Amino acid sequence: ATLFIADLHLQTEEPEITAGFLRFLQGEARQADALYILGDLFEAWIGDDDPNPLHQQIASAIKAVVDAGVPCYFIHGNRDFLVGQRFARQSGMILLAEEERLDLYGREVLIMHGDTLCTDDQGYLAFRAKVHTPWIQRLFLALPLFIRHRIAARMRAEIMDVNPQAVVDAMERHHVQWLIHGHTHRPAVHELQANGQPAWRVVLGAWHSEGSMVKVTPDDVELIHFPFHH
Amino acid sequence: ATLFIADLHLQTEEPEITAGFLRFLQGEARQADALYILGDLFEAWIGDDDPNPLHQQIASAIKAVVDAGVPCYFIHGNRDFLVGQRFARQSGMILLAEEERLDLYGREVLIMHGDTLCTDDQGYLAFRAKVHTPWIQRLFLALPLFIRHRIAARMRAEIMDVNPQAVVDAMERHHVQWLIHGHTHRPAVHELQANGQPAWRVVLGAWHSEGSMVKVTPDDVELIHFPFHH
């Protein structure tokens, strides 16, 4: 089985979500062929040089999974787009592109965070375009850490769902009948049409009282919710 | 594993849902310790004497599961409250009460359809009280089938969510930390408090483009959505 998760929004303020994630990495994840994390692993990221102890606890847990023989992969979310090659090295995770077309036991699946599909949000997309410009990233990252923290705090003081056409267009660009994403925090299986055939869009949930994952096997694709009852 | 499903709303008009259900009974269900169907198996029911061919195709498929060594159980929904002992015999299913407290590998779980929790719907509950009165049922069922059909058709020409307090009260009456239901067609895992401890309410989805089930093992409880991709 290949596993997909997203929208953990991990942070110092929410230790119970972190514990649920650590339990998942130590249990479920070890049995998998691979683990894909489709963005918003962290609630925020201002650079890999951040000494936040949570960051190292998380990289250390993911690295254990990778070292146990289960490749882990990452696609950036809107929250954690500044996750970089240094974290990748610490965690053993491989950074992937904003869209990837996978071959899962012969089934072709498109994966992404899902924020790019939300084309009705002009505000978000203007923001995204700027923070995805390399020289704007390298500017922000060249500031002293204490100034990056002030910038984030000052920003602080509902997520728009996908545009249906944008979904079709993406599945048609990749010629696939399967899409897995998060971002929208609306866990669901959807049926549609793409490439003249039936297609499915499987949406992951955010981690709060529950976790969620998509499990892909040779014959099946399942969206699973689990409570943190341990 | 023990499996829970609900809200299939099976009907002549929707053969693709019926095929998804038959595939599930022939595959997934055969591997289980038991199968519980928590109501709204059928979109409508006007009595067991109805010769609708769908009714016999469904009973025959469920009976195969029971005969293969997997007990099947049923709790009535609002739609199919007139399902009776004759169908039970045809299907091999055991009829259970509107609330049951189960022991699943040491875990105590409350199961029900969920309509009784929806105490904000005065209209529904007035209806329910009447159609659950035995002598009102036996009156309706004593009519000729052709008159029962007219009555249903004439009735034809959104589902209220649960009352949060009603949920707590039910879990507290049974002294349980686990509740599984359907009815509301809002598949989700919810955390709450009952009996002074953390509790979980696991809600099944309706079958249309997807199926859903709750899988209970010694150590885990999972809500699973599956598309009908075969």
Ligand SMILES: Cc1cc(C#N)nc(N2CCN(S(=O)(=O)c3ccc(NC(=O)c4ccccc4N(C)S(C)(=O)=O)cc3)CC2)n1
């Ligand atoms: C390179 C660059 C330049 C400048 C500078 N100066 N600033 C930064 N960020 C880095 C990321 N951090 S963050 O992690 O705390 C963060 C903060 C806000 C968002 N905002 C959004 O994602 C967003 C924006 C618009 C509309 C919707 C949005 N999301 C959907 S939402 C509702 O979750 O916030 C994302 C990450 C804030 C500072 N980066």
Ligand SMILES: Cc1cc(C#N)nc(N2CCN(S(=O)(=O)c3ccc(NC(=O)c4ccccc4N(C)S(C)(=O)=O)cc3)CC2)n1
């Ligand atoms: C014993 C008795 C007496 C009389 C007579 N005369 N009539 C009957 N029924 C049997 C059931 N059939 S049914 O299966 O077609 C059916 C029809 C309507 C409902 N209505 C509701 O469930 C309902 C009613 C009020 C508010 C909400 C409701 N549901 C939530 S909903 C929106 O799904 O319909 C249920 C079953 C209709 C006739 N039974």
Ligand SMILES: [Mn+2]
């Ligand atoms: Mn998110």
Ligand SMILES: [Mn+2]
């Ligand atoms: Mn996001």
Ligand SMILES: [Mn+2]
């Ligand atoms: Mn229903």
Ligand SMILES: [Mn+2]
């Ligand atoms: Mn119902």
